[PDB]
Structure formats: C-alpha cells, structure tokens
Amino acid sequence: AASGSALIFDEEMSRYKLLWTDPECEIEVPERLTVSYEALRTHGLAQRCKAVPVRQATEQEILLAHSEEYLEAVKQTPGMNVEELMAFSKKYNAVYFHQNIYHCAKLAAGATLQLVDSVMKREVRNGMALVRPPGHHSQRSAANGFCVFNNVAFAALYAKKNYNLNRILIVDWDVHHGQGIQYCFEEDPSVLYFSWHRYEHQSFWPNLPESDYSSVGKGKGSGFNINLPWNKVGMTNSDYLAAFFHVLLPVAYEFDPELVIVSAGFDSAIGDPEGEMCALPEIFAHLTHLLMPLAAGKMCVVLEGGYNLTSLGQSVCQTVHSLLGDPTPRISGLGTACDSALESIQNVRNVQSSYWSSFKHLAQSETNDIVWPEPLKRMPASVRTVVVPPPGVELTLPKNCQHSDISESTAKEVQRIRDKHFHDLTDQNILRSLGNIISVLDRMMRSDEVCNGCVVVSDLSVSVQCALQHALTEPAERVLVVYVGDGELPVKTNDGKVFLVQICTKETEDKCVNRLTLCLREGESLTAGFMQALLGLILPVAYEFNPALVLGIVEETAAKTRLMRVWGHMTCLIQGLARGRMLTLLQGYDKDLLELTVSALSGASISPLGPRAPKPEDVEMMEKQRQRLQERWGLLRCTVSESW
Numbered sequence: 001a002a003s004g005s006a007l008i009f010d011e012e013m014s015r016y017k018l019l020w021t022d023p024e025c026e027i028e029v030p031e032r033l034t035v036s037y038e039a040l041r042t043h044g045l046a047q048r049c050k051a052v053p054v055r056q057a058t059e060q061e062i063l064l065a066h067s068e069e070y071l072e073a074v075k076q077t078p079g080m081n082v083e084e085l086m087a088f089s090k091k092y093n094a095v096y097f098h099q100n101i102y103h104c105a106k107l108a109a110g111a112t113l114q115l116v117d118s119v120m121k122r123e124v125r126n127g128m129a130l131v132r133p134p135g136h137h138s139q140r141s142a143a144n145g146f147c148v149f150n151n152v153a154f155a156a157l158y159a160k161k162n163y164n165l166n167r168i169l170i171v172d173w174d175v176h177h178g179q180g181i182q183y184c185f186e187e188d189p190s191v192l193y194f195s196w197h198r199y200e201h202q203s204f205w206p207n208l209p210e211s212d213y214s215s216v217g218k219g220k221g222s223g224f225n226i227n228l229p230w231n232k233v234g235m236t237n238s239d240y241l242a243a244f245f246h247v248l249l250p251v252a253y254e255f256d257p258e259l260v261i262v263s264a265g266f267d268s269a270i271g272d273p274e275g276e277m278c279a280l281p282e283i284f285a286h287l288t289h290l291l292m293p294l295a296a297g298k299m300c301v302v303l304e305g306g307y308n309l310t311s312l313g314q315s316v317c318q319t320v321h322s323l324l325g326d327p328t329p330r331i332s333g334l335g336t337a338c339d340s341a342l343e344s345i346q347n348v349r350n351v352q353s354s355y356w357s358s359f360k361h362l363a364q365s366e367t368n369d370i371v372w373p374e375p376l377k378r379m380p381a382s383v384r385t386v387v388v389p390p391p392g393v394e395l396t397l398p399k400n401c402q403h404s405d406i407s408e409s410t411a412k413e414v415q416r417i418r419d420k421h422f423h424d425l426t427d428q429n430i431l432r433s434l435g436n437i438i439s440v441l442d443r444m445m446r447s448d449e450v451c452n453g454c455v456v457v458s459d460l461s462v463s464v465q466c467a468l469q470h471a472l473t474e475p476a477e478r479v480l481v482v483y484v485g486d487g488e489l490p491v492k493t494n495d496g497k498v499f500l501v502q503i504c505t506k507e508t509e510d511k512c513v514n515r516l517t518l519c520l521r522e523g524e525s526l527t528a529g530f531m532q533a534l535l536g537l538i539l540p541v542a543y544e545f546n547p548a549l550v551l552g553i554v555e556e557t558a559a560k561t562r563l564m565r566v567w568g569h570m571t572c573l574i575q576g577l578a579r580g581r582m583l584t585l586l587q588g589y590d591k592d593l594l595e596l597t598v599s600a601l602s603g604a605s606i607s608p609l610g611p612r613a614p615k616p617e618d619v620e621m622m623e624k625q626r627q628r629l630q631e632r633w634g635l636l637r638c639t640v641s642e643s644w
C-alpha cells in the first residue's frame with residue numbers, strides 16, 4: 001500500500017517573466033514559485049516529501065489536448081525577440097510570452113504527468129506539483145489567462161489513456177473559472193469537473209455565459225460539469241464549506257472517482273488582489289482533507305493561480321500538511337453561507353437534480369493591505385493512534401500506532417471516581433477500561449505525542465460517563481459525541497458543551513437543537529443514506545460546533561450492520577474536527593471493526609465504497625432534520641432563507 005507524498009518542483013519554471021508594461025499580466029511573477037517552495041522548506045514540509053524530478057511533456061502528450069497548429073505556433077516563440085513576443089501575445093487574452101515560456105510550459109505539463117505516474121504507480125499516496133505557467137484556462141488552440149498548455153487536462157487525458165481509468169474527478173478551487181478544462185471534457189462522462197469561481201453575474205473575467213451554473217455538460221457528458229459561480233466577493237470559510245458539503249462532496253462520493261486531480265489556485269484565499277475573497281489559508285487544509293478519502297487517497301494537486309505572496313505560501317503549506325496527514329487546524333466562527341452563496345448553491349443543486357442522486361428529491365414536490373493571523377503549527381503526533389484491545393489480543397498495528405500501562409495517579413483517579421459515582425462496582429475489567437480511557441485521553445489532551453485512540457470496552461454507560469466527564473474537566477470546551485446504537489446514554493446536552501449525533505434503528509423524536517438523531521431504514525440503500533447524512537447533516541453541524549474532542553461510540557448490537565461499511569469514511573472525515581483528537585469506544589471485540597477503526601484513525605487510505613441511491617423515506621427524514629436544525633446551525637443551509 002502506498003506511502004508518502006510527492007513534491008514536484010523545479011526552479012527552471014521561475015525563469016520566464018513579463019518583459020513589457022501590462023497591468024493586466026504583471027501579477028503573474030516568478031516569485032510565486034520561489035515563495036511557495038521556500039515556505040514549504042521553512043516549515044519542514046518539502047523535506048518530508050518525495051522529490052520527483054520534472055520532465056518535458058512530449059509532443060505526443062501535448063497533442064492529447066492541443067492542436068498541431070497551436071503547438072507549432074507556440075514552438076516558434078523561443079526564437080522570437082521582444083517585439084515579436086508582444087505581437088504574438090496580443091493574439092490571445094490576458095497572456096504574455098517569453099523566450100523561455102515554451103520550455104517552461106513543457107515542464108509544467110511534464111511535472112503534472114510525473115505526479116500522475118508516481119501516484120498511479122503507487123510510488124506515493126498523493127502529491128503536489130508546483131508549476132508555472134498555470135494551465136486551466138488554456139484551450140485546444142489558444143493560450144489564455146497566463147496559461148499556455150492545460151496541465152490538468154493533460155493529467156486526466158494521460159491517466160485515461162495509460163491507466164484505463166473510467167472516472168476522474170477534477171476539482172478547480174482557483175478563484176477563476178477553468179473554461180479550458182470545461183471545454184475539454186464537456187462531452188465526456190468519464191471526467192467530472194467542478195469549479196467555483198468569482199463570476200459577479202458574468203462581469204468578472206473571463207466574462208463567459210457558459211461559466212454559469214446552467215452549464216452542466218453536453219451530450220453523454222450532461223451532469224459531469226458543475227459550475228458554482230460566486231456573484232459577490234468576500235466569500236468566507238463558511239461559503240467554501242457550504243459549497244463542499246452541499247454540492248461537491250455529495251456528487252464526488254456518488255461519482256466514486258478512481259483518481260482526484262486538484263486545480264489548486266490559491267487566489268481564492270484572503271488577501272488575493274484577483275479573488276478578493278476572505279477564506280483563510282487554513283480552509284485549504286480542510287478542502288484537501290475532505291477529498292482525501294476518495295480514490296483510496298490518490299490525489300494529484302496541481303498549482304494554478306495565487307498572487308498574494310503571503311497567503312500563497314501559507315495556503316500551499318496548509319495543503320501539503322494535509323497531504324502528509326498532519327492534523328487539521330480548528331476552524332472557528334463558522335455559520336451560514338451568505339445569501340448570494342446560498343442562491344448560487346440552491347441554483348446549481350436545482351439544475352443538477354436531473355443527474356445526481358443526492359439532489360434528486362429536489363425535482364418533485366412530493367420529495368421536496370489585508371492582514372490576518374499567522375496559522376498555528378501543524379505537527380504530527382509522535383504516536384498518531386493508541387489502541388487498547390481486550391487483554392491478550394495482540395494485533396499487527398500500522399507503523400504509527402501503539403498499545404496503551406495504567407499509571408499510579410491514573411489508578412488513584414479510577415479509585416476516586418469509583419468511590420463517588422459507581423460505588424457498588426468491582427468488576428476489575430471495567431475498572432481496567434476506565435484506567436485505559438483516562439490514560440488515553442490524558443495522552444491525547446495533555447501531550448502532543450498522541451493524536452487519537454481507540455479503546456475496546458464491555459460496559460457502555462460507565463465507560464461513556466467517565467470518558468465524557470474526564471474530557472470536560474481538564475478543559476475540552478466542547479465535545480462532539482457520535483453514537484451508533486440504540487438507547488439513551490449518560491450524556492446531557494442541555495448546556496451547549498456537548499452535541500450528540502446518534503445513528504439508531506428506532507425512530508425517536510428529538511426535542512432540542514443539540515442533538516441529531518438519524519433513524520435509517522434497514523436494507524441495501526442504507527450505505528447511500530448514511531453517506532448522505534454524513535456530508536449533508538453531520539459534517540456541517542460538527543464543523544460549526546467546532547469541538548475540542550470527538551467521542552465515538554459503537555454499541556455491540558450494531559458492530560455488524562451495513563452501517564459500518566462507512567465507519568472508515570466517517571472516521572477519516574470526522575478527523576477534520578478537534579485537530580484529529582478522537583476517542584472511539586467499541587463495545588465488544590470485533591476484529592475487523594477494530595482493524596478498520598485503527599486504520600482510519602491512523603490516517604491510512606480506505607477502500608472506496610463503489611456503487612447508488614437512498615430510500616426516499618430516509619431523504620425525507622434527513623431533510624426534516626435539516627429543517628429542525630438549520631436555524632440554529634446555519635452551515636446546514638443549502639437554500640436562501642424565507643424573509644418574513
């Protein structure tokens with residue numbers, strides 16, 4: 001199984017620049033590459049990636065996406081003087097040429113192909129190519145928007161041809177629309193293109209009607225092009241995450257790509273003079289993290305734009321941190337997307353409802369100078385995951401996992417807690433597990449040596465009570481509890497410090513807004529239903545709640561239901577919260593569930609779900625939960641609110 005993250009970079013790509021006055025092009029500078037690599041070096045991140053050399057894309061590889069006429073014309077630019085390069089540049093929109101840009105364009109494209117090969121050959125899990133010139137605007141026969149050749153279109157075409165892939169996801173989170181990519185794949189159902197972009201009702205460059213939400217693809221490709229236009233500037237973390245939870249992720253997990261390619265322009269970040277958005281560099285840690293469970297982790301991140309040298313370096317670092325598996329930063333202050341964003345989101349969801357299961361209930365009425373704080377450090381835990389199996393059970397752990405050793409003080413605390421709240425308890429196995437829970441929690445909370453943990457337990461109520469209560473003291477300001485099982489737990493949600501997600505079998509009305517109860521009907525559609533709940537309900541609320549610790553709980557009766565085909569996906573996605581600090585209590589020994597839990601907790605790749613559609617009874621149940629909760633938890637909203 002693949003390990004490591006590739007970093008593809010070469011300083012030759014900084015050796016072309018603009019040679020005449022052009023206020024429109026002067027932002028695209030060599031230093032974008034320099035500053036990004038050096039930020040990766042400053043933070044120790046480049047040193048932890050597998051350096052993979054660049055190469056030239058061959059003529060045959062260029063012709064996968066471009067015409068002979070356009071290649072032949074670009075092939076002449078190395079012989080041109082400055083006057084001739086100016087004349088040639090003026091034939092295109094917002095692009096400049098330089099004696100060395102053809103060379104660099106072949107390197108940017110070859111670097112991307114190097115990244116695809118490394119990932120697809122399983123030499124690395126994932127990676128990032130830091131390239132110039134960018135590519136997502138270039139077209140079959142035109143340079144455009146600082147782009148000469150379409151680096152990301154190459155990668156998907158090349159991955160199709162040489163690895164016989166049937167499903168490729170391209171995510172373009174650059175602030176501009178990648179119209180070159182859209183045109184390349186508009187008729188192709190094998191490539192799903194998603195782009196958000198500043199649009200402002202078509203007044204923002206490149207000013208194209210087909211960058212609107214109504215362009216869904218053409219022909220056999222209808223439904224595999226998704227445009228989310230931003231019609232105001234100032235979009236925040238909340239807007240970007242609303243886009244992911246309510247548009248991109250439901251479609252991406254249903255598509256089930258075999259490879260993910262990211263057109264990663266960071267001009268969508270705060271401070272950028274082109275984007276004028278307000279999302280913090282830390283959001284890219286989460287945009288990367290939320291997509292990493294797809295395609296068994298096979299993700300190729302390719303640099304596009306980004307022009308504020310400061311937010312550029314920080315956003316590159318946040319992305320590579322997540323590719324390397326470092327713990328995600330906590331995102332505070334999340335809430336409803338703004339009204340303009342909710343309008344764009346509801347519009348794209350409505351036009352896409354003809355094509356995607358997650359949105360299908362919408363189709364009929366029966367169914368429905370700028371400055372910001374420096375990012376904190378993101379250091380991997382010495383031991384990522386600690387595991388406490390039943391006594392005697394030895395298991396093969398991934399290289400970054402360990403078994404627990406109850407201390408003397410810990411043992412005194414269990415006696416104290418025993419001598420207050422469970423006085424008639426002497427079952428020295430339970431008392432061992434309570435020492436295990438406290439020992440694990442103290443390593444998670446106090447030390448940065450250990451990130452998360454999993455403890456197998458016998459008695460739920462005493463273990464849950466001591467886990468939760470021990471977390472609340474020694475401050476964990478807020479605790480998210482995720483319980484798979486029936487019955488009521490010793491968990492009080494009447495103070496705002498605990499949010500409880502319960503996935504159960506009995507349909508029970510819940511009364512207050514700090515509890516989300518999901519009764520999913522039994523059957524084969526249960527896997528699709530849980531995934532829809534996870535992306536569209538659980539993750540929006542959890543992200544807004546912003547817990548300091550996550551407590552997972554699985555009762556023994558549920559440990560062999562179809563609902564635990566998704567346990568790995570939830571465990572990976574839920575580590576976007578609380579900087580990955582999650583304690584899981586498994587009731588009873590299940591060898592596989594404990595293996596899967598530890599695997600996901602440790603950051604391993606997880607198997608795809610493959611293939612369908614969920615029961616309409618479940619969709620109605622979930623939308624009733626959204627109605628009940630979205631006034632309190634605005635990140636749940638995916639429509640504009642009713643004005644009174």
Ligand SMILES: O=C(CCCCCCC(=O)Nc1ccccc1)NO
Nearest residue numbers: 023024094145174176205265304305
């Ligand atoms: O980042 C990019 C390319 C940016 C496209 C060029 C912007 C168009 C423009 O008109 N820019 C401008 C002109 C004058 C003054 C300031 C900006 N794609 O992802």
Ligand SMILES: [K+]
Nearest residue numbers: 172174176196
């Ligand atoms: K974009």
Ligand SMILES: [K+]
Nearest residue numbers: 185188191224
């Ligand atoms: K397509």
Ligand code: NA
Nearest residue numbers: 089090092094
């Ligand atoms: Na021009």
Ligand SMILES: [Zn+2]
Nearest residue numbers: 174176265305
């Ligand atoms: Zn851009």
